[PDB]
Design a binder for these strands. Structure first.
Lengths: 362, 122, 185
RNA sequence: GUCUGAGAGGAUGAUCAGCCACACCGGGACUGAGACACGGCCCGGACUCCUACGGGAGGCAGCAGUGGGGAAUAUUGGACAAUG
RNA sequence: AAACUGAAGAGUUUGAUCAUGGCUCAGAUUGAACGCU
RNA sequence: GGUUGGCUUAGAAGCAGCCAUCCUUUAAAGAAAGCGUAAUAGCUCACUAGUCGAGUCGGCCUGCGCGGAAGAUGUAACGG
């Protein structure tokens, strides 16, 4: 059970979630073993205090049987351990979380939820005066390259990718002269055909696209695009457009992808304001928890690191200030479980005085 | 009569010494700025460790011109230099001292601060 | 007595720390012994002048927007929210009983009712402060439009006494009004 | 002279006493036995303030004291009774 | 009569040793600051 | 009226969707043809009775018409 679709459904007791700040490079990862030891120390002490020593010992030996072969030279940003009385699942995440221990019925999966909510799937259109390429990219990896062996190009009414610019002027025949200065018009029409192929492929999937290429090529394409509202980013400082591989292109578009995610988080503020005006936004922790538990909330807006402990009972729907170690984690779990959405807004865009908001369904 | 690419002295202590007009504001094809008219400037010469630095693009108001300003009786009033006072984003003065005289065309609401801080007003 | 909510805190070299506001009661004069009661512990000072528009004033009385110098006190030991009271006139409190009237949807307010454990913002004179509402024993809900006597626990002390009105917001949207009926300890 | 050192040396030049230099910055002098004058003058300058916008004023490195800087250094006291 | 009175070493390189040699410490002092009192 | 049909779903109450279309007071009333609600609520409809009083309703085919119908020197797409 290494996935979010299994952690939320393994409802053990006690369910122990341990988070360790790890490092990818040396000697920063030199203190990763010590951090792991300290987190397991507090885990053992709390488990003995809250439960029996036998159930602390079985859990800790199970964690140790899996962490004894851990290589700390291959650590990502966070090491998450999900331990039970019977199973232990440890996963490495490129997300940064604050080191903590959560002992509850369910596994603390708000970091997995945030990582999945930050997911961006997009197209990369790589332009050149000589060719066009199309890549499908998920977050920071290439999904596919759109070459000859693909299903999405089987039944195509346009030129399939990779598209060569075999214009009559490029080969030197066809009925045109260089003294006519038609080259810009030729580039515009070639990019128009490229956009035709892009739209044909996009109609079956409908994801935002990033335009990569020279500034002039991007210009011509933007003026020629049939659906220019779906364009979310343009990068003109990416190198080796014709020979570099898809992973290299996706590596080079990551700054623009992050800027796009930031723009989405900025846009979320307007919807929060609309809910506040319509009287459908709850910002108190008690009200937010009650609405989330009774399934009244459609969107949650957390401040990306707003952990809070409280006394929560699901009988009178009360939340008194400190117990549950992550009351915000419980709110996120209820919102997700009742078919809602969770948005983890950045700190510089959501105030620390009001770090949680809930757009309710009524 | 100040147009784009004309240089101006700075009649204030914002830190700038010379500014260059890069836009006469207030109209599609507007040609000249006289005294009291708002211009976009680039700072070409700034005092070390001042508030503005060389290359800032900001607002200024023309305060004196070599071409001169006309008066209702038909008199003209000419200065030996073209000078400007730097403004903030809301077109409000950013200085606390004014150098040299100004004219009464700055009288009003926004540039009353320049008028009150000027050594002499004509 | 004399009371002035502190609005702005700045300083003049040679003269000292000037705390401008609006005098709501009494008068202030050069030599008056005063106290700063509010967010932090009470600090006892003396008045060394009153001015307005960079001009010395004869005396500042209730109604005008006068500013006042404080003797010795520095400009990080006073902040917007405390009040310059006359010694012993008022006391800094964090627990009280109110006559809170919850706004209804028609006037703004909310659809949801106030419930015990709710921590809205409390606007006393010229300062907001988080405070937990504790409904009087025998009640777990307060519908909008009603008006009941609850007990408020502020996070940090606010100078107040029985009679002071205040507003309860939840984001800049007013969700209730109230008047302190009794201060506790 | 002070600290250190057995000494020779080394480090240092608060408080007390002698000498020198300076008095917001640059410059000039007047009066006088004595000054190029800390709480005098003239000119210029920066800064601060008053103005009726024409013009004016000012200098705590005196003693208290303020703001500021700082790790950090005090009273907005009394008397000329004593020595000057 | 007197002003003529004053001088300590230790630890640490080596398997051990002697030497060399740096580092460190025990003293005195202050217009001292900070912490506890 | 059983009844918020069962399921599903945060909620699914005639009216998101999936599976039946049953019964009762009936002159008649769909486990509902629409609007509406987060869901209920609410407004209609189908249907029935009453009023009035004579023809009326909806498909099919066929002829001729209408819209769909924006361009560059000047009407300028009957030669007038």
């Amino acid at each position: 059970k290494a996935t979010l679709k299994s952690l939320r459904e393994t409802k053990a007791n006690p369910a122990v979630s341990i988070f360790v700040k790890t490092h990818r490079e040396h000697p920063a990862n030199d203190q990763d073993p010590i951090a792991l030891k300290n987190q397991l120390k507090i885990v053992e002490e709390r488990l003995t205090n809250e439960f029996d020593k036998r159930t602390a010992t079985t859990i800790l030996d199970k964690i140790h049987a899996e962490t004894k072969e851990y290589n700390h030279k291959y650590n990502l940003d966070t090491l998450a351990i999900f331990a039970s009385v019977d199973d232990v699942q440890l996963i490495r995440m490129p997300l940064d979380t604050p080191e903590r221990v959560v002992i509850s019925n369910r596994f603390a999966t708000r970091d997995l939820v945030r990582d999945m909510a930050s997911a961006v799937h997009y197209y990369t259109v790589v332009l050149t005066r000589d060719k066009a390429r199309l890549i499908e990219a998920a977050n920071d990896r290439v999904v596919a390259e759109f070459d000859t062996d693909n299903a999405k190009q089987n039944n195509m009414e346009g030129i399939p990718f990779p598209i060569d610019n075999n214009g009559l002027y490029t080969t030197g025949d066809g009925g045109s002269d260089r003294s006519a200065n038609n080259e810009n018009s030729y580039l515009k029409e070639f990019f128009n055909q490229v956009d035709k192929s892009v739209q044909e492929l996009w109609g079956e999937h409908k994801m935002p696209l990033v335009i990569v290429g020279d500034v002039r090529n991007i210009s011509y394409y933007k003026e020629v695009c049939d659906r220019p509202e779906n364009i979310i980013a343009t990068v003109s400082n990416l190198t080796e457009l014709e020979d570099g591989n898809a992973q290299r292109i996706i590596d080079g578009v990551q700054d623009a992808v992050e800027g796009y995610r930031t723009s989405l988080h900025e846009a979320a503020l307007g919807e929060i304001d609309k809910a506040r005006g319509a009287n459908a936004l709850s910002t108190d922790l008690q009200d937010v928890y009650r609405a989330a538990f009774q399934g009244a909330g459609e969107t949650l807006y957390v401040r990306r690191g707003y952990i809070q402990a409280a006394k929560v009972d699901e009988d009178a729907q009360t939340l008194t200030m400190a117990v549950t170690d992550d009351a915000v984690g419980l709110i996120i779990e209820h919102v997700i479980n009742n078919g809602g959405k969770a948005v983890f807004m950045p700190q510089e865009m959501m105030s620390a005085d009001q770090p949680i908001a809930l757009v309710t369904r009524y | 009569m100040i147009q784009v690419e004309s240089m101006l002295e700075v009649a204030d202590n914002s830190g700038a010494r010379r500014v260059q007009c890069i836009k006469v504001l207030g109209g599609s094809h507007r040609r000249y700025a006289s005294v009291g008219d708002i211009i976009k400037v680039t700072v070409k010469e700034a005092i070390p460790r001042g508030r503005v630095k060389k290359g800032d693009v900001m607002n200024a108001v023309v305060v004196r011109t070599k071409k001169g300003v006309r008066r209702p009786d038909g008199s003209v009033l000419r200065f030996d230099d073209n000078a400007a006072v730097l403004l903030n984003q809301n077109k409000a003065p950013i200085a606390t001292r004014i150098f040299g005289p100004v004219t009464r065309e700055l009288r009003g609401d926004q540039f009353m601060k320049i008028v009150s801080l000027a050594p002499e007003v004509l | 007595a004399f009371l002035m909510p502190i609005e702005d805190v700045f300083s003049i070299s040679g003269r000292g720390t000037v705390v401008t506001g609006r005098v709501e009661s009494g008068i202030v004069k050069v030599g008056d012994e005063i106290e700063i009661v509010g967010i932090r512990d009470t600090q006892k000072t003396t008045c060394t002048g009153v001015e307005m528009f960079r001009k010395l004033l004869d005396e500042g009385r209730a109604g005008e927007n006068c500013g006042v110098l404080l003797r010795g006190t520095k400009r990080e030991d006073v902040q917007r929210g405390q009040v310059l009271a006359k010694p012993g006139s008022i006391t800094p409190h964090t627990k009280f009983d109110a006559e809170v009237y919850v706004l209804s949807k028609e006037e703004g307010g909310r659809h949801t009712p106030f419930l015990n454990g709710y921590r809205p913002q409390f606007y006393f004179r010229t300062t907001d402060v988080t405070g937990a509402i504790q409904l009087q024993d025998g009640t777990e809900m307060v519908m909008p439009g009603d008006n009941v006597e609850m007990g408020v626990e502020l996070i940090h002390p606010i100078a107040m006494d029985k009679g002071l009105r205040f507003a309860i917001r939840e984001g800049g949207r007013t969700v209730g009004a109230g008047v302190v009926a009794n201060v506790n300890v």
